[PDB]
């Protein structure tokens, strides 16, 4: 019992609960016992029939039991490099989309400044540009001394003027 | 020979207590990445395995001490802890190296700082650089001594931001994204500004 | 120590246990790396976000705060200090040996 | 000739070959036949060792059985290994990526010695991969080839050493058996001996001979003449067999108290038990030959015996005395000498049979362990062989061998010769071999025993030089693993036709003659002194009457890749080596014209390479088409050869097959029916016949550069069809499913024109770098939707587009048309990997023309890139007006020592223009030995030249003398080979004539299109922020420390810091620099490299308090 429990929750780099390492072990044993009796690899639907459970769960457990690999094992037939040299860092900044984002921000500032200042501020705090949080209408009213219906109307004015092709063409290109 | 280290421990204000170790540091996770490859397969730097071994041995020793066990088992666990820290700091220095899957020695901290493949002479002294290319050479007998030929495609790829700016300024592309699209599509106007 | 490329000397010496626990931002005490299903790191594991900072930028474990406006505040629930995400390359752990 | 469809290749060969070259694939087919035990191999051993006809699988099964328990009352045995029909024919297993394999069946006998019951269960052993007719395996669709390995044959190896102190000689031995513990017997620095057992440096022979049940009287009786061992036995200092046993126990198993019986049984279980020490069947016979123990007894009891040890002692001690011959009591006399480790009589060859045998042996060892565990845990009579058997380790072992092993590698097939040479190649690295770092200088050298066995020319130029080579053309592998070559035996100066085969060790005790000797057809050499190869590899003169062997033919020492080089004997060894290596990497062109000047080996090499269709059975052709040929055999029935058209080779070349027969012709069994990629009329053709002028032209052919005319580009003389494949799979994901669909977000329509609604490119549509190939869309999940994105959709009404378009796009720098699309999916009830549910693979091909930078070379070692392709006007042309096609420099040939290709050039011009020798007043003096039918040659006539018996200088000069013109009366070239030619640039004639003639050139697989790479800002690695490397990834050139030395020496500091910090490492530096250069602003100050911070954290993690101090 102690050995099995320890091998269950301690022998894996990605720890797996015993309750379902049990079913991985049982799936493996039944598939390799049926393989020799039938002569072929057991299709997961037949394995599910032996499971009394849905096959999709069988594929899920099959892909769960797969263990991680090492980043530093030599990958070539000849020993010259490791696996980790060929993995791209996804989290790294593209260094191209950053400049694009900055220029898009500049274009947005120019477009908003072209619009009337009240509308620009309304939309800026509506979508939370200058700050971290977009705000609801009542905040806009409390900061501009107007009712929320008036803010809805000025927002209607904003996207109405923003559909103007002068801004529409100059901004739609940025995609 | 003894004085060579004794005098160093004397005149320098560091206690030799640091020779023995009872609290082991843990490298940042991003320096020992666990990343999912395309296909669901997972990769690790073998450091997670050694750290896991250290953690397992330490926890089991804690359990043995708290529970109360005959001194033989406690001594065996302490020896395993010592050998696990041994493997973590320098695998294969003492005894046979700690081996994982595929029957290969595991890369400890020391092996990450040794030889050609170590950090010092592979990433610090010489680095892979951007804005560079490589191609076959062909004799250029009509060139001048200070000149050299350059393939058009390689020159375009190298001077990408340069032609990007120089063409978005000449109003060929309205914005930077359009300039990138022209460059990747290799529009005819690109070559003139490239030259 | 501010990493501004204004350096006068680089020093190396033996590290005592007091320095080792001074560097660390917590004590890793579980051999758990990634949840097999949720694909997230665990608590006090080798990849714990509380010890080593958040994996995703400006989010705690349960996502109490998903906004830039929370800077430098350690959440009361999981203790993940909501900040930039490359602190996982900077912060450090430590193990107290039996 | 002797080939039904052989083109008329006239030959300059003087003497005839008594035997034809054997099927050059016989080292792969025969070994696998031995492995399986097919009836062909069964009858093969019937007259070549029928004393014990047993296959590899049969041998392993017999060795394994019987397996029993601790009690011995219950046991299991294996017998009757029977195979089965293959699951699917070759092409479909190459299509849907399944291993070409067949089920394996064996019979298991369950015995129960307690009472006695029988259970003969036919258990399914597993799925054994099979070997195809070409000698290549198929694993997961890919075509893999295993190579034979060179290792030290287990046995006994005496050697000599100088102490370099008092110049005393010392003799050591190393009985090195496979799967056992070594014994090192030697004479120490002082007088006594050293008997190192399993690396323990104590205890001279005194304790060993005593431990064998002897005492002082035996060791003093056997050794009274050897004063060394007399002194040793006097220095015994131990009396008592049990004392010697415990002393051994000290240095054989310390850490456990010894007992009276533990050491006695330990010695037997260590050396004389065939489970912990079993020198293989090769090792036992090697020991027997080395010591003369058994000379007429069958092979049994592979474990080492005691008389072997005593004979080793006697041999070593007599060697230290300087004795010549040792006669062991109870055996024949054997001469006493040191054993060379590189002599091919001590280096065996593990073919495919031996390697698969070893892997099966490991699998059966695991089988025996698991069945031994299981046979006891279950009660008697409730246990059956099926439950005793769990075939998992055997298939695991075979899969381990075939994949992720460096001795069974990806087939190198870009022309028939590369496929031919990849098999029948001898390697030395791998499990049981020596690594290149482990390899010394001595092993890489050519041994005198290499002659006739392993070619001394064919070997790669890289670090692996000498480590791996190629088999000879006449070489044979003995059924014993040793290599062996044929040779005719001469008696009293009479040459016999009887061909006998000798190994490396059997050659020393004989005297072989020269290959090309002045034979008078009566067996008698006209001069007494003949070039012969002596015992120790020495070459010397000797009268004729005492020689007893001769080479079967010239070109016996050379391989098949080097036998195709004309005028080989006129070339330096290095240039011949490189020429043989570049022959392996030619590309298949679209026409593959046969070479004018070559060797007879081209026909055989093309025929048995397996990629040319050969009519197995004779008969008339029913019908011919590009796709297929229907041939009607004489016995009513017909056979349809399905031609393979435009198949991608493992290196992305073309493998088209064009039939060369008509609808009403008759073809004989063995005649070539269709040509492969690089074959013309069934003979090897790896290049084209190009007119050559050897003048140095205006510096465009400077430093091995080669200039070409635009005729080659326009006439498609050198152009290759190149095919690439692009796999892409849609797999299940927690986000849902990825769809192969046209619902691709934010894409135009001009790029959507060439996709079907199924979502993939239309067949026959042109693509290029960056174009989309398959539309695969993945659920994006969630992320930070930028507020700016919300304003963006608010301006145009664009949908959120909730999915991520990670579609497959053509990678950078390629284009061409699409050839085929193969799609598999789960609803197609296919055997897809668990996890993926669509997988589509697209084939894109482009007719790659010849351009600057492409490497062109001859088969004589001359190489070079295309300096320029200048138009037909600017080409030196002869008085007839035909422009030259290729111009090469003249400053390389005399320095680099490859004058053979100049002779090839002249012979090619003679063969092209045609010739006739005036036989009016008798034959001229030079043509007296020239064979008939070679005195007349029509224009564009093909010739042949054996490598070591070819056209001589006088014959070639005479041929050049009479070189009748084609159409007009114009002898363009003079008697000395040079010809006048008119400049195409200025127009005036060149002051002096230059050599011109037809040369056979080949395009190598080092094209510049797959060799140009550049990047501005690509991806970066995880741990350190350095950019990755390679062409598959976006790359980035490595600026190593050696270039750092140069930049520091220049005194350029800002450039170095730029190349280190911001151009490579400093992330904020990278983005700021890119923003500044795009914004047209000044590049900012470089920051601190990230890799240094990584190093600092790593060093901190090593308990090293490292802090950087500002002040
Ligand atoms: Zn949290």
Tab-separated table of N, CA, C and O in Angstrom, chain C residues 1-16 19-20 22-23 37 39 56 66-67 86 89-92, chain D residues 734 1021-1025 1057 1086-1088 1090 1092-1094 1096-1111:
chain	number	residue	atom	x	y	z
C	1	UNK	N	23.246	48.175	-7.522
C	1	UNK	CA	22.226	47.153	-7.317
C	1	UNK	C	20.951	47.483	-8.084
C	1	UNK	O	20.024	46.676	-8.144
C	2	UNK	N	20.911	48.681	-8.671
C	2	UNK	CA	19.737	49.118	-9.418
C	2	UNK	C	19.775	48.695	-10.881
C	2	UNK	O	18.775	48.877	-11.585
C	3	UNK	N	20.896	48.144	-11.348
C	3	UNK	CA	21.041	47.653	-12.719
C	3	UNK	C	20.827	48.779	-13.735
C	3	UNK	O	19.921	48.744	-14.570
C	4	UNK	N	21.688	49.789	-13.644
C	4	UNK	CA	21.692	50.919	-14.564
C	4	UNK	C	23.004	50.994	-15.346
C	4	UNK	O	23.299	52.012	-15.972
C	5	UNK	N	23.781	49.909	-15.337
C	5	UNK	CA	25.093	49.849	-15.988
C	5	UNK	C	26.036	50.923	-15.454
C	5	UNK	O	26.808	51.529	-16.200
C	6	UNK	N	25.975	51.156	-14.146
C	6	UNK	CA	26.920	52.015	-13.432
C	6	UNK	C	27.499	51.176	-12.299
C	6	UNK	O	27.025	51.225	-11.163
C	7	UNK	N	28.535	50.406	-12.617
C	7	UNK	CA	29.103	49.428	-11.701
C	7	UNK	C	30.566	49.747	-11.443
C	7	UNK	O	31.298	50.134	-12.359
C	8	UNK	N	30.990	49.578	-10.192
C	8	UNK	CA	32.378	49.787	-9.816
C	8	UNK	C	33.113	48.509	-9.451
C	8	UNK	O	34.342	48.476	-9.568
C	9	UNK	N	32.407	47.464	-9.027
C	9	UNK	CA	33.051	46.229	-8.606
C	9	UNK	C	32.003	45.130	-8.511
C	9	UNK	O	30.825	45.409	-8.282
C	10	UNK	N	32.441	43.889	-8.708
C	10	UNK	CA	31.589	42.715	-8.585
C	10	UNK	C	32.223	41.763	-7.584
C	10	UNK	O	33.400	41.412	-7.719
C	11	UNK	N	31.449	41.347	-6.586
C	11	UNK	CA	31.972	40.609	-5.445
C	11	UNK	C	31.263	39.271	-5.304
C	11	UNK	O	30.050	39.176	-5.512
C	12	UNK	N	32.027	38.243	-4.948
C	12	UNK	CA	31.517	36.891	-4.769
C	12	UNK	C	32.043	36.342	-3.452
C	12	UNK	O	33.227	36.496	-3.133
C	13	UNK	N	31.164	35.708	-2.682
C	13	UNK	CA	31.571	35.124	-1.417
C	13	UNK	C	30.613	34.036	-0.991
C	13	UNK	O	29.556	33.835	-1.591
C	14	UNK	N	31.009	33.326	0.063
C	14	UNK	CA	30.161	32.281	0.618
C	14	UNK	C	28.844	32.871	1.101
C	14	UNK	O	28.805	33.964	1.669
C	15	UNK	N	27.760	32.139	0.872
C	15	UNK	CA	26.425	32.577	1.250
C	15	UNK	C	25.966	31.775	2.458
C	15	UNK	O	25.881	30.544	2.393
C	16	UNK	N	25.672	32.469	3.552
C	16	UNK	CA	25.155	31.818	4.743
C	16	UNK	C	23.658	31.568	4.589
C	16	UNK	O	23.006	32.076	3.673
C	19	UNK	N	21.480	34.691	4.400
C	19	UNK	CA	21.382	35.291	3.077
C	19	UNK	C	20.486	34.490	2.147
C	19	UNK	O	19.749	35.078	1.345
C	20	UNK	N	20.535	33.160	2.240
C	20	UNK	CA	19.720	32.321	1.369
C	20	UNK	C	18.241	32.538	1.649
C	20	UNK	O	17.433	32.660	0.722
C	22	UNK	N	17.153	35.250	2.978
C	22	UNK	CA	16.887	36.653	2.686
C	22	UNK	C	16.533	36.849	1.217
C	22	UNK	O	15.636	37.635	0.889
C	23	UNK	N	17.231	36.149	0.319
C	23	UNK	CA	16.911	36.252	-1.102
C	23	UNK	C	15.509	35.735	-1.397
C	23	UNK	O	14.776	36.332	-2.193
C	37	UNK	N	-4.862	18.901	-14.754
C	37	UNK	CA	-6.059	19.285	-15.488
C	37	UNK	C	-6.156	20.785	-15.718
C	37	UNK	O	-6.272	21.229	-16.863
C	39	UNK	N	-3.956	23.003	-15.589
C	39	UNK	CA	-2.768	23.548	-16.246
C	39	UNK	C	-2.301	24.835	-15.573
C	39	UNK	O	-1.880	25.787	-16.232
C	56	UNK	N	0.594	35.236	-15.369
C	56	UNK	CA	0.016	36.216	-16.274
C	56	UNK	C	0.144	37.608	-15.670
C	56	UNK	O	0.148	37.774	-14.447
C	66	UNK	N	-7.815	41.908	-12.280
C	66	UNK	CA	-7.345	41.722	-13.646
C	66	UNK	C	-7.048	43.060	-14.314
C	66	UNK	O	-7.191	43.196	-15.530
C	67	UNK	N	-6.642	44.059	-13.538
C	67	UNK	CA	-6.528	45.411	-14.053
C	67	UNK	C	-5.159	45.997	-13.743
C	67	UNK	O	-4.511	45.649	-12.754
C	86	UNK	N	7.438	39.247	-15.520
C	86	UNK	CA	8.778	38.683	-15.632
C	86	UNK	C	9.480	38.602	-14.285
C	86	UNK	O	10.673	38.290	-14.243
C	89	UNK	N	11.282	35.553	-13.519
C	89	UNK	CA	12.691	35.410	-13.856
C	89	UNK	C	13.594	35.992	-12.778
C	89	UNK	O	14.811	35.784	-12.818
C	90	UNK	N	13.026	36.722	-11.820
C	90	UNK	CA	13.825	37.478	-10.864
C	90	UNK	C	13.735	36.917	-9.449
C	90	UNK	O	14.763	36.710	-8.799
C	91	UNK	N	12.523	36.669	-8.960
C	91	UNK	CA	12.345	36.221	-7.588
C	91	UNK	C	12.917	34.817	-7.411
C	91	UNK	O	13.331	34.157	-8.365
C	92	UNK	N	12.934	34.354	-6.165
C	92	UNK	CA	13.711	33.177	-5.814
C	92	UNK	C	12.986	32.412	-4.717
C	92	UNK	O	12.158	32.969	-3.993
D	734	UNK	N	-8.875	21.819	-25.171
D	734	UNK	CA	-9.849	22.220	-24.161
D	734	UNK	C	-10.714	23.373	-24.648
D	734	UNK	O	-11.862	23.513	-24.215
D	1021	UNK	N	14.886	32.766	-27.631
D	1021	UNK	CA	14.846	31.586	-26.781
D	1021	UNK	C	14.210	31.908	-25.431
D	1021	UNK	O	13.957	33.067	-25.091
D	1022	UNK	N	13.955	30.855	-24.652
D	1022	UNK	CA	13.226	31.013	-23.398
D	1022	UNK	C	14.132	31.493	-22.271
D	1022	UNK	O	13.929	32.580	-21.718
D	1023	UNK	N	15.136	30.692	-21.914
D	1023	UNK	CA	15.949	30.992	-20.737
D	1023	UNK	C	16.744	32.270	-20.958
D	1023	UNK	O	16.625	33.239	-20.200
D	1024	UNK	N	17.568	32.289	-21.996
D	1024	UNK	CA	18.261	33.493	-22.423
D	1024	UNK	C	17.544	34.083	-23.628
D	1024	UNK	O	17.019	33.357	-24.476
D	1025	UNK	N	17.519	35.411	-23.698
D	1025	UNK	CA	16.764	36.108	-24.727
D	1025	UNK	C	17.499	36.170	-26.059
D	1025	UNK	O	17.137	36.980	-26.918
D	1057	UNK	N	29.695	46.330	-28.463
D	1057	UNK	CA	28.623	46.470	-27.484
D	1057	UNK	C	27.258	46.423	-28.159
D	1057	UNK	O	26.317	45.815	-27.634
D	1086	UNK	N	22.782	51.571	-25.254
D	1086	UNK	CA	22.568	50.160	-24.917
D	1086	UNK	C	22.452	49.947	-23.414
D	1086	UNK	O	23.081	50.642	-22.614
D	1087	UNK	N	21.637	48.971	-23.040
D	1087	UNK	CA	21.394	48.617	-21.657
D	1087	UNK	C	22.276	47.482	-21.178
D	1087	UNK	O	23.405	47.300	-21.645
D	1088	UNK	N	21.755	46.711	-20.228
D	1088	UNK	CA	22.483	45.595	-19.627
D	1088	UNK	C	21.968	44.283	-20.209
D	1088	UNK	O	20.747	44.083	-20.296
D	1090	UNK	N	20.543	40.622	-20.718
D	1090	UNK	CA	19.709	39.779	-19.872
D	1090	UNK	C	20.419	38.490	-19.481
D	1090	UNK	O	20.204	37.976	-18.375
D	1092	UNK	N	23.455	38.109	-18.652
D	1092	UNK	CA	24.257	38.349	-17.458
D	1092	UNK	C	23.410	38.250	-16.197
D	1092	UNK	O	23.856	37.696	-15.188
D	1093	UNK	N	22.190	38.788	-16.230
D	1093	UNK	CA	21.298	38.653	-15.085
D	1093	UNK	C	20.927	37.195	-14.851
D	1093	UNK	O	20.823	36.746	-13.702
D	1094	UNK	N	20.727	36.440	-15.933
D	1094	UNK	CA	20.451	35.011	-15.806
D	1094	UNK	C	21.623	34.308	-15.133
D	1094	UNK	O	21.441	33.474	-14.239
D	1096	UNK	N	23.806	35.680	-13.131
D	1096	UNK	CA	23.869	36.117	-11.742
D	1096	UNK	C	22.888	35.334	-10.881
D	1096	UNK	O	23.234	34.873	-9.789
D	1097	UNK	N	21.657	35.163	-11.367
D	1097	UNK	CA	20.673	34.392	-10.612
D	1097	UNK	C	21.092	32.933	-10.493
D	1097	UNK	O	20.903	32.307	-9.443
D	1098	UNK	N	21.661	32.373	-11.561
D	1098	UNK	CA	22.125	30.990	-11.524
D	1098	UNK	C	23.234	30.810	-10.498
D	1098	UNK	O	23.246	29.833	-9.740
D	1099	UNK	N	24.183	31.744	-10.469
D	1099	UNK	CA	25.279	31.675	-9.511
D	1099	UNK	C	24.771	31.857	-8.089
D	1099	UNK	O	25.273	31.225	-7.154
D	1100	UNK	N	23.776	32.729	-7.908
D	1100	UNK	CA	23.150	32.879	-6.601
D	1100	UNK	C	22.500	31.576	-6.157
D	1100	UNK	O	22.576	31.205	-4.980
D	1101	UNK	N	21.857	30.867	-7.088
D	1101	UNK	CA	21.235	29.589	-6.760
D	1101	UNK	C	22.254	28.526	-6.379
D	1101	UNK	O	21.873	27.490	-5.826
D	1102	UNK	N	23.532	28.751	-6.670
D	1102	UNK	CA	24.597	27.839	-6.286
D	1102	UNK	C	25.229	28.208	-4.956
D	1102	UNK	O	26.400	27.886	-4.727
D	1103	UNK	N	24.474	28.886	-4.090
D	1103	UNK	CA	24.918	29.270	-2.755
D	1103	UNK	C	26.142	30.177	-2.793
D	1103	UNK	O	26.994	30.118	-1.906
D	1104	UNK	N	26.236	31.023	-3.815
D	1104	UNK	CA	27.333	31.971	-3.964
D	1104	UNK	C	26.768	33.379	-3.858
D	1104	UNK	O	26.077	33.843	-4.771
D	1105	UNK	N	27.063	34.055	-2.753
D	1105	UNK	CA	26.562	35.407	-2.533
D	1105	UNK	C	27.276	36.363	-3.477
D	1105	UNK	O	28.396	36.802	-3.197
D	1106	UNK	N	26.631	36.694	-4.591
D	1106	UNK	CA	27.207	37.564	-5.608
D	1106	UNK	C	26.350	38.818	-5.681
D	1106	UNK	O	25.185	38.756	-6.091
D	1107	UNK	N	26.922	39.954	-5.288
D	1107	UNK	CA	26.252	41.243	-5.377
D	1107	UNK	C	27.155	42.212	-6.118
D	1107	UNK	O	28.371	42.217	-5.908
D	1108	UNK	N	26.561	43.027	-6.980
D	1108	UNK	CA	27.298	44.042	-7.721
D	1108	UNK	C	27.167	45.371	-6.987
D	1108	UNK	O	26.058	45.808	-6.662
D	1109	UNK	N	28.302	46.006	-6.710
D	1109	UNK	CA	28.351	47.189	-5.861
D	1109	UNK	C	28.525	48.443	-6.705
D	1109	UNK	O	29.446	48.524	-7.524
D	1110	UNK	N	27.635	49.417	-6.503
D	1110	UNK	CA	27.762	50.691	-7.203
D	1110	UNK	C	29.014	51.438	-6.766
D	1110	UNK	O	29.719	52.018	-7.600
D	1111	UNK	N	29.303	51.442	-5.469
D	1111	UNK	CA	30.487	52.112	-4.942
D	1111	UNK	C	30.824	51.593	-3.548
D	1111	UNK	O	30.077	51.820	-2.596
